[PDB]
Amino acid sequence: WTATSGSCKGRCFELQEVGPPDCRCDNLCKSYSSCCHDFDELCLKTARGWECTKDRCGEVRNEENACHCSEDCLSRGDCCTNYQVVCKGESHWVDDDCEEIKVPECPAGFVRPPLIIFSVDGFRASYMKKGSKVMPNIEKLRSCGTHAPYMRPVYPTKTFPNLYTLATGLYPESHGIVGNSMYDPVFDASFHLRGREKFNHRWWGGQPLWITATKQGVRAGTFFWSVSIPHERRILTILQWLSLPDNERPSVYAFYSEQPDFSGHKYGPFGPEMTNPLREIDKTVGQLMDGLKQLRLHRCVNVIFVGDHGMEDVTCDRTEFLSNYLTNVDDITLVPGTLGRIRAKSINNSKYDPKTIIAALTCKKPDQHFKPYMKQHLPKRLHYANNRRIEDIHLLVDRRWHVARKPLDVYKKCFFQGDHGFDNKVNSMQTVFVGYGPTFKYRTKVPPFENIELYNVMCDLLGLKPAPNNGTHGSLNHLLRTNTFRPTMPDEVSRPNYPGIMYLQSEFDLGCTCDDKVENKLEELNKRLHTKGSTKERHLLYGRPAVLYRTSYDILYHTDFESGYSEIFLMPLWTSYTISKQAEVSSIPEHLTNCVRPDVRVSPGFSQNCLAYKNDKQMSYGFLFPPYLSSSPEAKYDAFLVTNMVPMYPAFKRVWAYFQRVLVKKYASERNGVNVISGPIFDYNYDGLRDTEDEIKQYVEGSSIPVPTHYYSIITSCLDFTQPADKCDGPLSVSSFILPHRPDNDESCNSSEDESKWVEELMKMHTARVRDIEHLTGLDFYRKTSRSYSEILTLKTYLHTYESE
Ligand SMILES: *[C@@H]1O[C@H](CO)[C@@H](O[C@@H]2O[C@H](CO)[C@@H](O[C@@H]3O[C@H](CO[C@H]4O[C@H](CO)[C@@H](O)[C@H](O[C@H]5O[C@H](CO)[C@@H](O)[C@H](O)[C@@H]5O[C@H]5O[C@H](CO)[C@@H](O)[C@H](O)[C@@H]5O)[C@@H]4O)[C@@H](O)[C@H](O[C@H]4O[C@H](CO)[C@@H](O)[C@H](O)[C@@H]4O[C@H]4O[C@H](CO)[C@@H](O)[C@H](O)[C@@H]4O)[C@@H]3O)[C@H](O)[C@H]2NC(C)=O)[C@H](O)[C@H]1NC(C)=O
Ligand SMILES: O=C1NCCc2c1n(CCO[C@@H]1CCCCO1)c1ccc(Cl)cc21
Ligand SMILES: [Ca+2]
Ligand SMILES: [Ca+2]
Ligand code: NA
Ligand code: NA
Ligand SMILES: [Zn+2]
Question: Strand 252-260 and strand 115-121: pairing?
Fold first, then answer.
């Protein structure tokens, strides 16, 4: 109930929300059907439109008008945005040369530069270049301020997940808005874009920027705008709030535009109808900047122009139907479209089985345009599994396609030509970032970055401490002139042991054998030096990784590689080695095929054993440092140490062996040497974080050898590829992956073919940031470089995407 009989007189776009049944006058009252009776009349004036004209200049104030052109309007803070241009001979902001804003130039009484976030729904990154001729105001913001060529959204690339990620710094699995549509089984409630459930606070986790601000004494404008409030009125409201007395005036504001997304769905991302929506958005930006210039705020305010996601060509005819695959399609519920989420239609149906649904959906049609995954098998870069609102069965849909349950769903709902939601690495899903103002840099291009990083920067711009989030604070310091955040590296928690030779061969009863009984003072001292770390400078190029949790581990040195060996997990946490451009690949000699050698530095009690692998019919083993890249026949024996062995399903060994034998050398050839760090990951609860030992669900049969859920590699070289990886003077270049450790290659439909036709495609899908691997391992990399720490944080957030231009 709303007592709509109260009044909005002197309350128009009030900032404090009043509680029911008292009527509302705020920018969301329309969405709740709760505005006072006179809200349209008083607050949504439209008379005489949005622009001053020559005859209006100096007019007598008529309170009925949408905006004013009378002499008093500047002191009232309610002139039309073009008032000074039409009536006082001023220029439009867009026509002024740009001039560096070295310091904020703010009116008296301003405690800090205000922040205005101008958000545009569906604004595809390539519109910045492709539409630049029809967007002069946006082009000026972009060329004069700080811009990225694109900004990566979060998955799914849908509106509500991305807008709430922008607001919180969190992945959707953590903030809880995991789609535009959701079912929460604990609440037994459904979230939809239409209707009222979405206003219930139980959906919304984390702490959004407007709450962070308010908690820390920084006042915020209300960020949300009811769809029917015209853009011109949104801009005029912001400008009016900026004229409030110092003690009442907010420091942070948001504008939102439903365009170009709205037209993009109807016409496709580049439909000829798209030019007009782009011109109109640019005109709104112009109104804001002219309005700021009139208030003497255009060299005081930081403006962010940012999108939520892009837009792809998608039509009804490119729809896959689950009814062409499943016999039991009436027993499932599908969340459809550019991603699929499947659960049982009825919790009383004990015939429901996810294993048979996945199998029926796997590689069934030659050109199949979606791939099914249990959510824990999704690429870890998507961070899309740790929430009960995310169904166990996920369909990753090819760009340009939809999935639906039955054909009747698609024509009892062709209309549309655009959609979004796909994998957030897809080029058409990328969106925009521009920052303009005193705190941003001048005429500066920055590399693409993820939208999870922006909350921290918005907090920096307002002097706020961010709530705990998934950004890496400091990784965007290169966007900022001042207000940088200068973090310290985390402290190492566990220090390593450096074991020497402590065990005789006969103390081991591991059931392993090796033909290494073939027998020099000159060269004996040399092998001892390698075991003491004499080659460590070559193979450990950026310092040893720091272990950020409590554990017992040993550093082990060898001619060709260094490792940090965990006595708890019975295998390395990390293995580090450098392969020069000139390195040669060799085979595993015949007499060493089944060779595994006790490591006399490490107790039998803290070693793997070969008998366990013999007995475990499903499990084999591989090596972290590859025997194929040994520097000499003699050094190759080190690669067969039991302390370099890790459990690997035979199907996974196909992938790993091809990476080690073929791809590493390929990368060294192309990048002028590479440093590689490889290791295991255990994430049995799919929370993106390192498992403790009591979370491990699978062991090699009969043993305490834990089975990794994933294997990672971090591959680093010199950004200036004219310098070899091991003699690099300047910035670094990285690519990394987190490969799922699966007992089949069902994910790769072409896996019966030679590995040259499918393995690298698999690896690209599972590309990762170093920071993703840090979370999953409790390790901290790049501890000892010559580079600034913020530069290193940016490098740790890099994702190599393998998308073209
Ligand atoms: C991305 O960044 C985020 C933010 O930093 C990281 O997420 C954090 O990770 C922490 C570890 O997973 C986690 O810490 C836990 O906090 C628990 C208290 O949580 C509440 O309070 C906070 C603070 O206000 C709040 O933010 C939480 O919000 C979550 O839950 C609500 C629903 O109530 C949602 O609306 C909201 O969206 C959010 O959900 C997300 O997180 C939860 C987990 O908290 C998931 O289940 C959801 O799926 C979703 O992803 C909460 O309201 C605290 O209780 C935990 O302590 C337990 O574990 C410790 C281990 O130290 C143990 O010692 C304790 O005994 C305790 O265990 C007991 O409970 C167990 C489970 O019931 C039980 O088995 C035991 O036997 C014990 O009885 C824990 O400290 C922190 O909450 C989140 N924060 C957020 C906002 O998500 C995230 O990791 C980053 N991601 C990556 C990849 O780096
Ligand atoms: O105006 C809105 N109308 C459409 C639904 C909607 C709007 N805003 C406000 C604008 O916020 C964006 C992103 C955060 C930073 C400021 O700019 C939202 C914010 C979050 C969510 Cl989840 C949905 C929103
Ligand atoms: Ca959107
Ligand atoms: Ca985990
Ligand atoms: Na075996
Ligand atoms: Na396959
Ligand atoms: Zn859309």
Answer: parallel
Q: CA torsion, points 553, 694, 686, 331, in degrees to nearest 10?
A: 160
Query: What is the Å distance from ligand 6's center to 748 Cα?
Result: 4
Distance set, CA 325 to CA 317, 361, 413, 441 (Å)? 18, 6, 22, 54
Q: What angle do CA 128, 123, 764 make, to 5 degrees?
A: 90
| Phi, psi angles (nearest 5°) of residue 700 | -65, 130
Question: What is the signed CA dihedral for 298, 299, 300, 301, rounded to 10 degrees?
Answer: 50
Comparing CA positions, the residue from 386, 426, 347, 477 lying closest to residue 765 is 426
Which residue, chain included where needed, has tokens 């998507």? Answer: 382
Q: Distance from CA of residue 26 to its chain's centroid?
A: 33
One-letter amino acid for residue 681 of the chain: I
Pocket test for ligand 2, best of 178, 203, 256, 464 (most atoms within 8 A of CB): 256
DSSP-assigned letters across all residues of 354-372: HHHHHHHHSS-STT-SEEE
Spatial contact of 522 and 621, defined as CB atoms under 8 Å apart: no
For residue 643, give both structure tokens: 């302390």
Q: Any idea what DSSP says for residue 61?
A: P
Sign of CA dihedral 126, 128, 131, 132: negative
Q: Give the span between the Cα atoms of 509 and 18, in whole angstroms.
A: 75
Backbone angles phi, psi at 582, to 5 degrees: -90, -5
Is the distance from the beta carbon of residue 681 to the nearest atom of ligand 1 less than 6 Å?
A: no
Whether 120 is in the pocket of ligand 2, judged by its Cβ within 6 Å, is no
Q: How far is CA 82 from CA 120, 137, 202, 575, in A?
A: 23, 14, 43, 64
254 Cα nearest atom in ligand 2: 16
Work out which ligand 1 atom sits closest to the CA atom of 203.
Answer: 35
Which positions are catalytic? Answer: 159
DSSP string for 640-680: TBGGGEEEE-HHHHHHHHHIIIIIHHHHHHHHTSEEEEEEE
| Residue 43, both tokens | 């607050």
Q: Round to whole Å and give the CA distance between 572 and 349.
A: 45
> Is the beta carbon of 254 within 6 A of some atom in ligand 2?
yes
Q: How was this structure determined?
A: X-ray
Atom of ligand 2 nearest to the CA of 162: 22
- Alpha carbon distance 742, 683 (integer Å): 13
φ, ψ of residue 31 in degrees (nearest 5): -65, -30
Q: How far is CA 404 from the centre of its chain?
A: 27
Strands 252-260 and 393-397: unpaired
Whether ligand 2 lies within 6 angstroms of the CB of 224 is answered as: yes
Q: Amino acid letter at 469?
A: N
Q: Dihedral angle at the C-alpha atoms of 400, 403, 406, 407, nearest 10 degrees?
A: 0
Fold designation for 505-797: Extracellular Endonuclease; Chain A (3.40.570)
Task: Report residue 596 CA to chain centroid gap.
Answer: 41
Q: For residue 575, give the 3-state DSSP assignment.
A: strand
Nearest in space to 718 (alpha carbons), one of 647, 651, 660, 668: 668
**Type of residue numbered 158:** K
Q: Which amino acid is at 591?
A: H
